[PDB]
Amino acid sequence: VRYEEIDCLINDDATIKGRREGSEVYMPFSWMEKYFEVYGKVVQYDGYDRFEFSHSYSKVYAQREQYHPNGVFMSFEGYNVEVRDRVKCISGVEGVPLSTQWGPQGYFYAIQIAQYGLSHYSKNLTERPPHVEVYDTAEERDSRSSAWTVPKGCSLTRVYDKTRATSVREFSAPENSEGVSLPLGNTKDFIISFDLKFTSNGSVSVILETTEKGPPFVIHYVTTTQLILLKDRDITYGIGPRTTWTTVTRDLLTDLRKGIGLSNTKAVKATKTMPRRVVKLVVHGTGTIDNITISTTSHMAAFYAASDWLVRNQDERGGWPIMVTRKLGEGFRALEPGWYSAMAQGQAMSTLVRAYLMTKDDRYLKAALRATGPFKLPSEQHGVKAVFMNKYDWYEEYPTIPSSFVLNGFIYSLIGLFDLAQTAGEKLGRDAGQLYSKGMESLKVMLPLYDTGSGTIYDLRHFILGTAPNLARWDYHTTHINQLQLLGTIDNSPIFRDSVKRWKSYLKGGRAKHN
Amino acid sequence: GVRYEEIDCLINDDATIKGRREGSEVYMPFSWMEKYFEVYGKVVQYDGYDRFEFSHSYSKVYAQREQYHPNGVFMSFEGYNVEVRDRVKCISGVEGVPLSTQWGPQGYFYAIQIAQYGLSHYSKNLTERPPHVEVYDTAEERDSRSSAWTVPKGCSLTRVYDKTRATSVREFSAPENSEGVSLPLGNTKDFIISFDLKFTSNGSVSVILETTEKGPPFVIHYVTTTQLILLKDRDITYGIGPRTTWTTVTRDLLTDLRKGIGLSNTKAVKATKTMPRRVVKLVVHGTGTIDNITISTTSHMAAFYAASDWLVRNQDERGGWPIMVTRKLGEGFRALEPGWYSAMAQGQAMSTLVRAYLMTKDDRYLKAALRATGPFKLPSEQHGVKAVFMNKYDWYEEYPTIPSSFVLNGFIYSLIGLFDLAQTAGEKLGRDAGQLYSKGMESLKVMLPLYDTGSGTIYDLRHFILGTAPNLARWDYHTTHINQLQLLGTIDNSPIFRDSVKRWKSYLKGGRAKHN
Numbered sequence A: 001v002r003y004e005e006i007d008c009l010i011n012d013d014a015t016i017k018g019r020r021e022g023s024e025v026y027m028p029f030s031w032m033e034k035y036f037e038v039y040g041k042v043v044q045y046d047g048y049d050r051f052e053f054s055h056s057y058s059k060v061y062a063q064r065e066q067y068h069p070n071g072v073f074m075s076f077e078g079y080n081v082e083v084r085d086r087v088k089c090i091s092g093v094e095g096v097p098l099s100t101q102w103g104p105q106g107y108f109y110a111i112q113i114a115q116y117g118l119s120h121y122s123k124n125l126t127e128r129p130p131h132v133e134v135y136d137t138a139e140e141r142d143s144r145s146s147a148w149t150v151p152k153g154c155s156l157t158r159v160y161d162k163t164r165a166t167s168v169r170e171f172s173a174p175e176n177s178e179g180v181s182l183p184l185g186n187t188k189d190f191i192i193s194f195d196l197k198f199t200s201n202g203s204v205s206v207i208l209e210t211t212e213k214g215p216p217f218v219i220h221y222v223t224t225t226q227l228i229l230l231k232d233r234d235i236t237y238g239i240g241p242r243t244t245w246t247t248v249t250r251d252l253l254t255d256l257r258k259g260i261g262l263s264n265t266k267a268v269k270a271t272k273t274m275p276r277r278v279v280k281l282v283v284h285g286t287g288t289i290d291n292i293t294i295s296t297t298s299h300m301a302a303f304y305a306a307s308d309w310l311v312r313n314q315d316e317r318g319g320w321p322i323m324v325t326r327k328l329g330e331g332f333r334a335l336e337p338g339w340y341s342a343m344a345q346g347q348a349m350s351t352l353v354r355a356y357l358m359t360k361d362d363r364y365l366k367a368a369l370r371a372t373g374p375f376k377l378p379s380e381q382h383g384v385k386a387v388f389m390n391k392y393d394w395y396e397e398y399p400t401i402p403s404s405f406v407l408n409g410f411i412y413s414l415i416g417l418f419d420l421a422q423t424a425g426e427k428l429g430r431d432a433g434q435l436y437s438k439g440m441e442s443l444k445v446m447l448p449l450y451d452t453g454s455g456t457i458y459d460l461r462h463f464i465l466g467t468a469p470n471l472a473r474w475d476y477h478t479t480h481i482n483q484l485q486l487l488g489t490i491d492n493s494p495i496f497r498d499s500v501k502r503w504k505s506y507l508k509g510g511r512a513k514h515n
Numbered sequence B: 001g002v003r004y005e006e007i008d009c010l011i012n013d014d015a016t017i018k019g020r021r022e023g024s025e026v027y028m029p030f031s032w033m034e035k036y037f038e039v040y041g042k043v044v045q046y047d048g049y050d051r052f053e054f055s056h057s058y059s060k061v062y063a064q065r066e067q068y069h070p071n072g073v074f075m076s077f078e079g080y081n082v083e084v085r086d087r088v089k090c091i092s093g094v095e096g097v098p099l100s101t102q103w104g105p106q107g108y109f110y111a112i113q114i115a116q117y118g119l120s121h122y123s124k125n126l127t128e129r130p131p132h133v134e135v136y137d138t139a140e141e142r143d144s145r146s147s148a149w150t151v152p153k154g155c156s157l158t159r160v161y162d163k164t165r166a167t168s169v170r171e172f173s174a175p176e177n178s179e180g181v182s183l184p185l186g187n188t189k190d191f192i193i194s195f196d197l198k199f200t201s202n203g204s205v206s207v208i209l210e211t212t213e214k215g216p217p218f219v220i221h222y223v224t225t226t227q228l229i230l231l232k233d234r235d236i237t238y239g240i241g242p243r244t245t246w247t248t249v250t251r252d253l254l255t256d257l258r259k260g261i262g263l264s265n266t267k268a269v270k271a272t273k274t275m276p277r278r279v280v281k282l283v284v285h286g287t288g289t290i291d292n293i294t295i296s297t298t299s300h301m302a303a304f305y306a307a308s309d310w311l312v313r314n315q316d317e318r319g320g321w322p323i324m325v326t327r328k329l330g331e332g333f334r335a336l337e338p339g340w341y342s343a344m345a346q347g348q349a350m351s352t353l354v355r356a357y358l359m360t361k362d363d364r365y366l367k368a369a370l371r372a373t374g375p376f377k378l379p380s381e382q383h384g385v386k387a388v389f390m391n392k393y394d395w396y397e398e399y400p401t402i403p404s405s406f407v408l409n410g411f412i413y414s415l416i417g418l419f420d421l422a423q424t425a426g427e428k429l430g431r432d433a434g435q436l437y438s439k440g441m442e443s444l445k446v447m448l449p450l451y452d453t454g455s456g457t458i459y460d461l462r463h464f465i466l467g468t469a470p471n472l473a474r475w476d477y478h479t480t481h482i483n484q485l486q487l488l489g490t491i492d493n494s495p496i497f498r499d500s501v502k503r504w505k506s507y508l509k510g511g512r513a514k515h516n
């Protein structure tokens, strides 16, 4: 056996250093990785080690049952919406994600808000119940024995609130004072919540020990409409006046990290900083607080925040307008502020339908019903409908001029229409049902146009514009697969099963046969 | 740390293969890579240091030298070798053109293949050095005893003046059971043999061939029958018909030998490594006359005119060259019954005929080219070649299937033919071809991205028409696609041709369309 070095000429161009063993040649994975865009690592278990090679990075969702409107949303149980770079932060006023853009403010992007709600809804169904720790349940025999710290000009007393039929804390602390504080001490869970009613300006601050060396970070939830601020180790979120009773719920993990990575660009700076201990809370101003709680998760609160945001922000045409200009790419006219997205409409429908089924609150269903509005108008008339080669109706993720035909957004619009049609019943759902079934006809014919024989294409701009195919990155390919296998459980066309099979093989280096 | 290790490589959680580990680097076996990535590579020893040469593809793009025009080389066909294709059964003895293989002992005439044969020989005539040409039996013996020929008893071989032919020729007589009259040749360099011939009975001209195979020479018999091709031991037989009026027979002994040795009753001629080594002699049986016995390196124009004349003589009343075998393109397409036309056949013929007309000014070639336009005007289902993509774009079908298939390469070849014709026939007569061409070019420009996978090309649009997997084009079809676009780019200034060529070329080296 002699394992020596052999020079490898690559396409008659560059030379790299390989290995040989007689007639057999071995090529360095460090070159393969970049040349083929593939993945691998040496993984070492207890008595031996192994190189694990992977053609791609994403995985297909393992479906457990037929898809249905009131269950998990496709694969969103495994989605983490809030860690996305383009999520600037969770709004203190709205409790929903804002998207990044150029400049200090964010914009509300209904797609992102709906995905936030849908994933939290889905996780509520699949995860174990959270650990819930309630604080300040001990009743001091007198003020001196209180768990609270009440400095010089401050007040903190327990009062029976007849209207709420419970005891609450009435607090008072001048804004320049240290404020009244309650030790917390949680090292495991990072979702904080409390019932709150302010009668002046003030704030609730949470002191956070972190993996960063030095002083703790402090997150201030203040009675302003300010989005988010970072100054040294002080992070600030405006939560509004809070002059009527509400339950405030905050993910300290997300709030901390979005604060640290705050910038005026399209991408939040990634941080490896993690919370280690929720130290205490500090209150300034006057009002009342109750039910101070730290939980592992609080999924339904986030779901309803998204659902209620959607109800409140739907416009008179039934749409959620994207209030920034979007320029999809060279060849496509800019979309001016106020444009709709078929994906936004559909994802909103899926969220609203679920909220309606949980509560029986008609306003969720009415909102979903109105959302079909833009589907009936062409892209150029402030709608979402495109037509492929004068023949096939399509619902646009981006209603561009000329049309773009993005696959994944189209399918999400169909899932949304399905959720609606199935839930509204025969009479009220006919409209959504008609739009759905017509879209499904288009999808079944057009699907092969997105198949490259080793992956999928994102959209049809190569054909519409006369340019290179806009290939889908692996996790969009994985979205396509998850989407088709979902449809496969609610529509028996062989096209979905045949396409799912072949598209899955692409993840494992499979390809269509050549002649 | 670890300095050399046979390491388990788990591939996508399925199979396990053996790599090598050396420090932080892992090396993977090319024997797996080759089949897994569908790539190519070989160890090439250099004088001093040998090297592994890796390639993403095979095949090359043609290096064009000038703007394309109708009387010059045909695309890249100067580098084509049509005769060695496994599906060329042989060169017909009667017609001097290739027959295609099929199931059974027979072959059929395939106009695409015949046109490509002519076009490549035409192109080689323009690019290769002129052949060496050796004429035999030019010496005039003073008497019969001193003849260069061997004349066994009961046979005769005399030089006579042939008045009609206005030249001196050899008159032969040799019974079929005899050894025949023979003439030594002795050529070790060149293997295209030709002779002027006129039989007055049944007989044959046989050529004794020494080869790289050990044992006795092979003998090729050119006999006065219409039999296609025979093999028995070292005798290969071709029927060349009656030959009762004077003609020039021209045979490629290299091709004739190999097709003989590899003779089968299947779709695929068996490959051989046997090569001719020496043309020993020719032997003649029967009665008749022979003249101008010659061996040349090449005889390109003879092959070109054989192809051109076949096209003229075999075009039907509707201007088409009908394919007389059934072709079943694949699952989902109806069988094409005998008699179907092909846009590629029509166009490749136009390109050949136009070239024949420009060399000779013989109107028969231009008329045939002009009429070849017929099938383009009729839908596939009505014995034509026209398909329509999504109710909008006219297309000319290499395979006029039901439903339509939209093969890219055959379409473009049909366009090149229409161009050749439109450019050659003039304004008035060429109007028809000109219209078909420009209508097809408009379709091509719109539909072209449908064939682009972001890393290769698709052969046709069956994936969309049938709802199935894309039928990916193998590398030498991808390379045809590129060659065709760069040709069109010299006669049409649309940026689409340039942009697509540039990207499609990058695919050959592992380039790809960007993903999001």
Ligand SMILES: O=C(O)C1=C[C@H](O)[C@@H](OS(=O)(=O)O)[C@H](O[C@H]2[C@H](O)[C@@H](NS(=O)(=O)O)[C@@H](O[C@H]3[C@H](O)[C@@H](OS(=O)(=O)O)[C@H](O[C@H]4[C@H](O)[C@@H](NS(=O)(=O)O)[C@@H](O[C@H]5[C@H](O)[C@@H](OS(=O)(=O)O)[C@H](O[C@H]6[C@H](O)[C@@H](NS(=O)(=O)O)[C@@H](O)O[C@@H]6COS(=O)(=O)O)O[C@H]5C(=O)O)O[C@@H]4COS(=O)(=O)O)O[C@H]3C(=O)O)O[C@@H]2COS(=O)(=O)O)O1
Pocket: A079, A080, A081, A083, A084, A085, A086, A087, A109, A111, A112, A115, A325, A326, A327, A328, A329, A330, A331, A332, A408, A458, A470, A475, A476, A479, B516
């Ligand atoms: O959570 C998940 O794991 C997850 C997975 C799934 O993918 C998906 O879930 S699903 O269920 O919906 O399927 C979902 O994806 C989210 C991502 O995880 C998340 N990534 S993040 O990094 O964590 O934030 C995110 O992704 C978006 C990001 O912007 C970015 O991600 S990243 O990893 O690359 O950083 C990525 O951007 C893509 C973009 O999608 C491509 N667009 S295209 O239409 O497909 O071609 C693309 O856009 C480029 C163009 O190339 C460029 O054109 S140009 O010709 O080169 O110039 C153009 O430039 C614009 C310029 O930006 C314009 N600004 S504007 O006016 O404000 O619109 C203007 O200046 O004009 C230029 C064009 O001018 S021109 O018309 O004259 O030509 O746009 C840029 C562009 O960045 O937009 O290529 C980029 C990659 O860029 S790069 O890094 O290679 O340079 O993917 C984005 C995306 O997928 O949307 O957000 C995902 C959705 O999350 S959420 O919003 O629903 O919460 O989650």
Ligand SMILES: O=C(O)C1=C[C@H](O)[C@@H](OS(=O)(=O)O)[C@H](O[C@H]2[C@H](O)[C@@H](NS(=O)(=O)O)[C@@H](O[C@H]3[C@H](O)[C@@H](OS(=O)(=O)O)[C@H](O[C@H]4[C@H](O)[C@@H](NS(=O)(=O)O)[C@@H](O[C@H]5[C@H](O)[C@@H](OS(=O)(=O)O)[C@H](O[C@H]6[C@H](O)[C@@H](NS(=O)(=O)O)[C@@H](O)O[C@@H]6COS(=O)(=O)O)O[C@H]5C(=O)O)O[C@@H]4COS(=O)(=O)O)O[C@H]3C(=O)O)O[C@@H]2COS(=O)(=O)O)O1
Pocket: A515, B080, B081, B082, B084, B085, B086, B087, B088, B110, B112, B113, B116, B326, B327, B328, B329, B330, B331, B332, B333, B409, B459, B471, B476, B477, B480
């Ligand atoms: O000289 C060159 O270098 C050169 C390069 C360029 O490529 C080209 O030049 S250009 O300027 O025109 O561009 C030109 O190419 C020639 C080749 O070099 C030459 N190769 S050769 O080996 O030297 O002879 C030759 O190529 C043809 C050969 O048949 C073959 O080549 S090989 O290397 O594979 O041996 C190859 O066949 C392909 C074929 O093209 C594919 N067709 S497809 O439409 O693209 O999908 C394909 O056909 C298969 C199908 O997969 C099969 O379908 S099935 O679903 O699997 O069953 C189907 O089976 C039929 C059956 O054959 C039928 N018989 S029939 O009734 O007589 O029609 C019937 O039984 O029904 C079945 C279908 O039933 S069903 O409807 O129910 O489904 O057809 C077969 C089939 O073989 O036809 O896949 C094969 C590869 O097969 S395999 O080996 O992987 O198994 O390529 C052929 C081709 O390209 O035409 O000839 C080329 C042109 O030369 S010439 O004629 O102009 O002189 O030169």
